[PDB]
Amino acid sequence: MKHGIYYAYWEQEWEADYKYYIEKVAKLGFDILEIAASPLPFYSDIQINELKACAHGNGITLTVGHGPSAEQNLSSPDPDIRKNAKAFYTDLLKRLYKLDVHLIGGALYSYWPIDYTKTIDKKGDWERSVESVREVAKVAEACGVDFCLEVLNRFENYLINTAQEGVDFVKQVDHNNVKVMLDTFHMNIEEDSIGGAIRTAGSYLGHLHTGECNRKVPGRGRIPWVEIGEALADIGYNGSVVMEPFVRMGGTVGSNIKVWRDISNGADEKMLDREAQAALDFSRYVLECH
Amino acid sequence: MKHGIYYAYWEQEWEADYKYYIEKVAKLGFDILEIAASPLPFYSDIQINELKACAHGNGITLTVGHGPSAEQNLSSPDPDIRKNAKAFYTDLLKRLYKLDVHLIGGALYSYWPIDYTKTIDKKGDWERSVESVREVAKVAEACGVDFCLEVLNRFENYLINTAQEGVDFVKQVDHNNVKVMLDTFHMNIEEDSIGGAIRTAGSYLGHLHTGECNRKVPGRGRIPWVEIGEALADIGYNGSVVMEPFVRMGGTVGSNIKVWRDISNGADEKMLDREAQAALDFSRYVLECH
Amino acid sequence: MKHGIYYAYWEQEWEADYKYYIEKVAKLGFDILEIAASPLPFYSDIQINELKACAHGNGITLTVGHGPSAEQNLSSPDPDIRKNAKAFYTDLLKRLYKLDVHLIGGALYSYWPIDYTKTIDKKGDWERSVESVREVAKVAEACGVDFCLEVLNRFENYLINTAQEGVDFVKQVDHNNVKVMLDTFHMNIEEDSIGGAIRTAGSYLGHLHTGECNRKVPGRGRIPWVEIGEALADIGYNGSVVMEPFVRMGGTVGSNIKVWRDISNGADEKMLDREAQAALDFSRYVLECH
Amino acid sequence: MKHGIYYAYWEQEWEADYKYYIEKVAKLGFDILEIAASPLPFYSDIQINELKACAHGNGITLTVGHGPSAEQNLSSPDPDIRKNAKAFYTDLLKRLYKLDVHLIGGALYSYWPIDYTKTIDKKGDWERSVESVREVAKVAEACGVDFCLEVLNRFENYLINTAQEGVDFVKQVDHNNVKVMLDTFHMNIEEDSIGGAIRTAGSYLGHLHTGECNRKVPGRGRIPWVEIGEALADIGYNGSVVMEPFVRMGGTVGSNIKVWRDISNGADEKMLDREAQAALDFSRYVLECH
Ligand SMILES: [Mn+2]
Ligand SMILES: [Mn+2]
Ligand SMILES: [Mn+2]
Ligand SMILES: [Mn+2]
Numbered sequence A, B, C, D: 001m002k003h004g005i006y007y008a009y010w011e012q013e014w015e016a017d018y019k020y021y022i023e024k025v026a027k028l029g030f031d032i033l034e035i036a037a038s039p040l041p042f043y044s045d046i047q048i049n050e051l052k053a054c055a056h057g058n059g060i061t062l063t064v065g066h067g068p069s070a071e072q073n074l075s076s077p078d079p080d081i082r083k084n085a086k087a088f089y090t091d092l093l094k095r096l097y098k099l100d101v102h103l104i105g106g107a108l109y110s111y112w113p114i115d116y117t118k119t120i121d122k123k124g125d126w127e128r129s130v131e132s133v134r135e136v137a138k139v140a141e142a143c144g145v146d147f148c149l150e151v152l153n154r155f156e157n158y159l160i161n162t163a164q165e166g167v168d169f170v171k172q173v174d175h176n177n178v179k180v181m182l183d184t185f186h187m188n189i190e191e192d193s194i195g196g197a198i199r200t201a202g203s204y205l206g207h208l209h210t211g212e213c214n215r216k217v218p219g220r221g222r223i224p225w226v227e228i229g230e231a232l233a234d235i236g237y238n239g240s241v242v243m244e245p246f247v248r249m250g251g252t253v254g255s256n257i258k259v260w261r262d263i264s265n266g267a268d269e270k271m272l273d274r275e276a277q278a279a280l281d282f283s284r285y286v287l288e289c290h
Helices: A018-028 A045-057 A079-099 A122-142 A163-173 A184-190 A194-204 A225-234 A251-256 A269-287 B018-028 B045-057 B079-099 B122-142 B163-173 B184-190 B194-204 B225-235 B251-256 B269-287 C018-028 C045-057 C079-099 C122-143 C163-173 C184-190 C194-204 C225-234 C251-256 C269-287 D018-028 D045-058 D079-099 D122-142 D163-173 D184-190 D194-204 D225-234 D251-257 D269-287
Strands: A003-006 A032-036 A061-065 A103-106 A146-150 A178-183 A205-210 A241-243 B003-006 B032-036 B061-065 B103-106 B146-150 B178-183 B205-210 B241-243 C003-006 C032-036 C061-065 C103-106 C146-150 C178-183 C205-210 C241-243 D003-006 D032-036 D061-065 D103-106 D146-150 D178-183 D205-210 D241-243
Touching: A003 A018, A003 A061, A003 A269, A018 A032, A018 A045, A018 A269, A045 A061, A045 A079, A061 A079, A079 A103, A079 A122, A103 A205, A122 A146, A122 A163, A122 A178, A146 A163, A146 A205, A163 A178, A163 A194, A178 A184, A178 A194, A184 A194, A184 A205, A184 B184, A194 A205, A194 A225, A194 C225, A225 A269, A225 C194, A241 A269, A269 D269, B003 B018, B003 B061, B003 B269, B018 B032, B018 B045, B018 B269, B045 B061, B045 B079, B079 B103, B079 B122, B103 B205, B122 B146, B122 B163, B122 B178, B146 B163, B146 B205, B163 B178, B163 B194, B178 B184, B178 B194, B184 B194, B184 B205, B194 B205, B194 B225, B194 D225, B225 B269, B225 D194, B241 B269, B269 C269, C003 C018, C003 C061, C003 C269, C018 C032, C018 C045, C018 C269, C045 C061, C045 C079, C079 C103, C079 C122, C103 C205, C122 C146, C122 C163, C122 C178, C146 C163, C146 C205, C163 C178, C163 C194, C178 C184, C178 C194, C184 C194, C184 C205, C184 D184, C194 C205, C194 C225, C225 C269, C241 C269, D003 D018, D003 D061, D003 D269, D018 D032, D018 D045, D018 D269, D045 D061, D045 D079, D079 D103, D079 D122, D103 D205, D122 D146, D122 D163, D122 D178, D146 D163, D146 D205, D163 D178, D163 D194, D178 D184, D178 D194, D184 D194, D184 D205, D194 D205, D194 D225, D225 D269, D241 D269
Parallel strands: A003 A032, A003 A241, A032 A061, A061 A103, A103 A146, A146 A178, A178 A205, A205 A241, B003 B032, B003 B241, B032 B061, B061 B103, B103 B146, B146 B178, B178 B205, B205 B241, C003 C032, C003 C241, C032 C061, C061 C103, C103 C146, C146 C178, C178 C205, C205 C241, D003 D032, D003 D241, D032 D061, D061 D103, D103 D146, D146 D178, D178 D205, D205 D241
Antiparallel strands: none
């Protein structure tokens, strides 16, 4: 099993010097760095090549997370937005092909964060999204990318809140490059059973995000890690596990992730490194081959 | 230990014939019905005495929950909003005295639901709220009402997200009628420890809301009910336990609680009744004595 | 699911007036009374018919538990003990036919309690037991009795300590009416996973005994009841659930179950009744199909 | 917090070259090797100083476990056995002083393994044991040794089965060098609450043994490690944590610990080393700094 961390653990904006984080997580012993998609459209082919060379040089696999804007919303009733969204993903998936990235994850069926004052048309957004994702999935297959649909808690999204809804959506899309993605933080709110949710996802599970109930690094909170390892073994999980911890106030990250107290308890960069490496040791030990 | 349920388990709007729910809940064997404050300011003295007489006649204690409007925001930097809020609560608390209600709970330090797009000033809102609540507390004392501040998950408020923040706030207020209120749904997201959060609240714990991780009736989900029972025994909790299950899509309640799937699994009124009664037997059994 | 309790919860010896306990458990709302086999060989035909009629008239199903003596040890290297053991079981099973009982459970592959000072030959005892049990199973089948092999913790037997070992033994026996019986008390010691153990048992699970870690009535201890409910649903469990609580010091039951402190906390008969009824309500609610 | 492991994890007899295991556990990063007391009475003064020199040289602290024989039974009604027991402990405690060992633990109030076929006089054995242990405590105080009384499950002893019984016994002994010792394996059977047992022990807790429910190395089983870390922080635990895993059949160890299946799943010495090191990383990470 391959283990990663989201760069945003260290950063307060949805961009960074990803080369700095490739070198860091390689030293800490991770297999994977997850990076935000949003700066990638601002990269020259030179910058893409040198990011790929950095990843290759440090023995790191890159995965991509994206929180789509309202303008990138494949579910939108406005056919202009759906057309611009499809263009955005087509460009992005081609960048991912040049980057040697084989996995993108997030609320890719919708947008994030969402405007909850808007009138909700779940059945309408659902039907439009399935159609749109099925189209985008043809580009994802051409670019060698797993298009992973993140199951989110009710506060962040209305379309897909449980593993069962995720399986329903992906089954309805009916394309090999579209996968369910589960997140221990999101499962913690919506699911009756964590092991049950993972077994429900079964062969459709393409990615797993990890974090404690309050998004601390895995190990010292209430997430049932042993039950998760057992369920991953039950479904013969052939895929990666990326921890997505957020312990710092401030910036767009602190605001979007709604960190309103110092969850890090005054941690400096070296303290964040030590706890990430401890969480990685824990994750390899507890989650692997049951 | 007294056990209650929120009328809203059965209803898709923030008011109802509370007399109907007093009779139902009395027959199901509850001690307490929790009602929404919203319609109480508009009750004639006749309507108040009718509700009180109905509660007394059925052996049911009434408690009150409130989601304050933006106009009722005691943390507001706008002094006219603060003035309205203080007048609103002063009138409400006089009515609760007439109604023979001795407990109100909710985001009473702030408002709910909140506009999260607005720039956040936590320090400013905190200092203003502490001052505002301390004033309202003196009217709460006169009216014999425990003014209980609900600790909420980061998605619903930024001010008080943990039992420790709740205790810090309530100690700063420094008034005996102002209490911390915990909710298993909210603790499930923000707390390192459920038992730890309860022991942290200790003497300041004035009210407890219950529900599964996804707001189903207590019993068949992942909430550590036994650990809660033990912590309530540890602190010597002398308060009441009110379940706050939300399993129904539709209406303002469905929208505000963000129920985007049929969590009830097609339950009619009779089925909701039986599940509430089973959850009550479970709650009396698992949460008491320890 | 059908729910039972072992009479011995109320009694300090391996016999009693079972008619008294049939009437008690019918009143408390149980489906099943489990009784000890020990006195049954000393029942006249009319005593058997009386017990059967008492059970039938009260809507109660009788199940039988047996701790075999050294002289009833089907695993014994001594061929005379094996011969006497088979004659004992043959007579007992014919008595169970007269009683209209269709389930016997316990360490029926061995004896209980065992002498652990003896040199252990697990390999030899296992081979003899599979052979012996296969022969007795044919008598059980003719009598309409399921022969359920209890998986026990290491302190009570050496042959079958895990669900996997139980499955291995029952597969070797290769008789349809020979089943694995799991016990929450025994699984709590020996199993990596409770849900895993139940899913390992699968179609071989013919009976389930319940009790907290320290053998209190189900509900207020550390046994993961929700996980058990989920696993029973996963395997489509068709059988019954009998709680086997032991909370009283004194006599052969006190000594054999090794109760060396008052686990009942001074409970009189009415208190034992009420705790059993609360555990039954808990068990129906929490274990019932997910 | 100092972490150790019992040498017997690697060995099937109650002795070995302790210097070999000092070197090994130093290499694996342990602070402590726990050793069996059995061979220490057979040690010359030169051998004591050798082992002390090896320990100091490798930066390892030595702790001692003892399973008393029947003739070392401080609870015995036979005053000759009590006389011999006190002589045995007086000599052992003087050797410990020379070895530079400041902690001994086990069923030091009784013996292990016990003959459970004997008539049990719990009240008598308790009264004698308290008096006997109080006298030995004077010698322990002189030799600078913490005399740690292991709380055991009902299958291994009848005197002290819970942390509460442990505290009552130690408080009755009323001596600063006599401590309660808890074991995750034994707590897992007898305790209503793991956190609650540790908080019950509080200031009396002198030593903690760790192991999964079935005595595997900590981390991948059902023991609530986070809850343990929390309770240790609550009582400000000043002591060490020694893992006591037993995963191998064969010899006196296999027999006494009742390992009747290959729990090690065919692990060689190298594999046992790796799993102990994984469990140490897990234990340092999860059990500290709550
Ligand atoms: Mn995520
Ligand atoms: Mn609430
Ligand atoms: Mn049993
Ligand atoms: Mn031990």
